Amino acid sequence: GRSLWQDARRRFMHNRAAVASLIVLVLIALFVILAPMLSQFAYDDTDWAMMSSAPDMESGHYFGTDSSGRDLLVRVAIGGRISLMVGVAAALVAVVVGTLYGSLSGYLGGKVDSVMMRLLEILNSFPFMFFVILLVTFFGQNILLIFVAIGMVSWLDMARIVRGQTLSLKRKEFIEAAQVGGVSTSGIVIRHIVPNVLGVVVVYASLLVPSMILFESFLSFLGLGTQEPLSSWGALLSDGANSMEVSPWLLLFPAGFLVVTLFCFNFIGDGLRDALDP
Amino acid sequence: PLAQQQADALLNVKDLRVTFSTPDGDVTAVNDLNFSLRAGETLGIVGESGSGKSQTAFALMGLLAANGRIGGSATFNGREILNLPEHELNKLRAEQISMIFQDPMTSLNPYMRVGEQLMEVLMLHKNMSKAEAFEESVRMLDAVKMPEARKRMKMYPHEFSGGMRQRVMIAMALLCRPKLLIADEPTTALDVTVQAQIMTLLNELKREFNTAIIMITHDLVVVAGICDKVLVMYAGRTMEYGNARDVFYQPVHPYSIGLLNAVPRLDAEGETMLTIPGNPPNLLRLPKGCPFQPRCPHAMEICSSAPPLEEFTPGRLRACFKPVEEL
């Protein structure tokens, strides 16, 4: 039979952009995983013979060197670990909080829906980047604080779309028919609402990860963010923006991996959008 | 005879073919359709979903989807309508031809006062001032039996019930006094009393303005009020054509018989409705030859070929291989 998620699989594989993207994104994951382990040089190591050099294939500094005499290939990989791990962690927090708020707001009906959707519209009018900078400067730049702070400000549109989907399903007929069939409230949620809410959750989670990579990379470009022993792609870009007159590769390598990664997730998200909701 | 009905026509449609370029392959939603109409006549184009009847109306108007393609001909007062450029077709679209639509809720623009939605017809087609256009719009709303017409002009269409929105649509379509009105399922969204009012209104306005009407519906019961000539369609193909009296009292094609038996009645009691068996037609992988073959009670091996649209009794068309006396 035409199992609807296997039609979604077929649509995703037909969308050549999305499959291409996934390949690319896995090759970036393999670089971010393996490059610090396969490298001749470490993240904190120095070679004063090459205080700042362009790429040279006989040297082994294949991306060139930062002005401390320090290897950019290893640093672009280690910083990619931080940006992807913060981005996925923040997305998980935003997906859990947004699904819980949206599903309760949509399922408990009009009384609660009215106030909970008013709060989203009010809260969406705060300067959340200023509010995360205010938390981070007053409480001190811990990477666990940045996971949670980026997540806790970015669940609002996730809650709005999961509310819309849940309220639509609560109005649909096959939920009335499940109640008439004697199915319990837990059965209606677990077997009838969750499988149909799950489509919106997977699409918006995939579209949210790149916004969290961007939010971290912004918050680490200004300073702030993560400190030197744990520098992300945004922290490499600010050292690059200063160095750009003499050694422009310090922008172009971090910028390439960040732009490519954000591109990739956008086409995977649009591939899932197309696949799960024609 | 049909040789005369081809000559004295207001509208004369020959071999009209409508095809949609959908990803599953070309779907021919209207298939070599032939008919003609005169001033004051009503043509009831009748059929279920997949009959293509709504696409015939949009093909004459040029209101098809982007992926649609039109072939054949439609002669109208000696001009030809089909595939005209928009800048010339807009010269017919309300001054001589006109249309009303299936959903009255979304057809009016919700962001505009109803009086301006009427007046924009007159100021473009009859070169009226904004002063003349208001008073003629008010006279047309009164002819359409709108209450307190002057007060209604300043309302946005969300202030109105679905029956009043069809009255606004009819006032807007008839404003120029057309030659032809095309009516895509006008009452399907509306209650039985509002339907009886709007059909009584169209049956009076047809006589005052001398319009012809193309009435598109699934309801044979509504066709019996306004109609003079019936055109039964299945899977985009003509199944029967003739006078309304003839088609309702001596239906000659099996699908016409099955449909007029499946339509429920108040006037006589009975044990069961004599329904047509099987599912509604799919235009993708539609059976070759006669489209009614998987449902027909009289099916024969010759029906694997396409039946000719022949005439038997002067003024009617048959589209079927069974001898005309054996039904």
Place this chain on the structure above:
Amino acid sequence: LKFILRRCLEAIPTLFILITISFFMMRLAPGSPFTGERTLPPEVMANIEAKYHLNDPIMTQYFSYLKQLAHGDFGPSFKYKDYSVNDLVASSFPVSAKLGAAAFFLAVILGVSAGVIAALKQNTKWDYTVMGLAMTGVVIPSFVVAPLLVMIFAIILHWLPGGGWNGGALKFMILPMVALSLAYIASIARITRGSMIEVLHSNFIRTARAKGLPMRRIILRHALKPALLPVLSYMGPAFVGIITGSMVIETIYGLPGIGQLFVNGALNRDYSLVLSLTILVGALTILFNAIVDVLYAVIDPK
């Protein structure tokens, strides 16, 4: 009428909740002068203790902060010696206002123009270029666009200056304005196109065509109002996005605006200046989103 009142009665307590969380978040933080560490230079502490009663009960110190905001005084900086926070806002606000207003008008004008020209010409080269550029602008971050524009036009070609404002002359404003607006030109164009396509396929535009109206009148009178209402709803986020993006743009190009002032405050741990500007930018956004939703409720007849 009733809508204006409902927005005002929601906006006022919204701003008071933001002031309340942001004050107690400073007053309970480590290193904050109110905790008593008194590591700051004596000349700065002499300014702090003249406006804040550091010994008083927690509640009394909150009401005295609301009193200062009610008289329009943000209090002294916790790192600058001779400069008040009001002084620092006054020297930096017009630099943010001129760049932000230019980037916002450029985002609306080019964004709506491109989006209409992508909904018309629906499947031509003109859509595939506009929705290509509207992918590129949303995905490439502003802090990657801005250094690349310095690299191309200031380092490589020498056509434009990479440095800060000589008094706001256009040659120093043009690269900041483009870098700040591209992320929003793209996003407005995407929203405008999607709205305009849903409108051009509507049953009311089908009825406008059925009246034989010329396409000029169908676009300008029938379609444009329903197409732009989703863009007006977007003006709220666009305002936040431009005041947000001003932090990276003012930091890269070296502009003395409220974004640079906020970031330098946050790096230096000036709790007063960071708290201050958050309440200011919050109030501007709460007010602007009320003005947008009121204008939407005046344009929309439903």
Place this chain on the structure above:
Amino acid sequence: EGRKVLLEIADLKVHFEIKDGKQWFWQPPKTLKAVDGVTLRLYEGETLGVVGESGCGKSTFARAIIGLVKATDGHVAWLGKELLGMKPDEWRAVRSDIQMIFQDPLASLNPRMTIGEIIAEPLRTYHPKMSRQEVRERVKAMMLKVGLLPNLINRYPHEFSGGQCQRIGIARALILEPKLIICDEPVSALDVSIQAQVVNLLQQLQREMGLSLIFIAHDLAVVKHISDRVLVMYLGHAVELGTYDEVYHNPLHPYTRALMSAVPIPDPDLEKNKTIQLLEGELPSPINPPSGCVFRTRCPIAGPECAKTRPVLEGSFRHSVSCLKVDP
């Protein structure tokens, strides 16, 4: 004397709160009086047709019997036990006997489930100890009864032609062997030939299993074929109630005279020759029904007494009316 009384309804009301953005935030909600003062009894082996204009509350009346909407006042009783005061668990004992068929063919079916699971979901819920084999055999037998081919068991509801979806809905209602099935516009969405298939099927299943039906529809002519008694409704009131001969051939209430003369007839020489009655003015909003008799703004034979008091159903089992100015 007579057949068993299966369901009794007396003084039933369903009022919904409405607080639209046009009110001030300070003001009380208005009441949408969706149903107000329905009173009837339904016998075993009987089809009651419920019919009316949009906004008559016939769909909310259906939903109030089976418990999808909370009634504000009155009594409903099944086989002698009251329904409206019931706790959320003891409804399961009653829903073994009372089941439902719905407006929209595709929406009625969970799009992530196969036919076999959709028809099995009641049976699995009421008989947890029954084997996978017994459940599959029960479902295949019921599919063959509604006219679906048994090998369609593993297909998903988007693979089906709409008329087949109401056959799945009927199979799901019948899998428990119920005693009342409520049909909320079961044939509104379907093509005219397919409507007659689903109505013949319901009428066969009524005769074959011994069911009663409550059949809710917009088309008066469909209701006449399947029903034994018809309840005519207007703005949540019961206006007329009687057997299918009396309500169509001897209508006494002015709204039924208007409705039955507005019904279109599939005969050119009758439809052009009938004595049409016509009603003055629009349907009043159910957010503020007129005081007294609710038909008073449209009625051809109105009088000042109809503002002072509200009519209630009076008459015999054969025919009863809610009017001050006619008597059977």
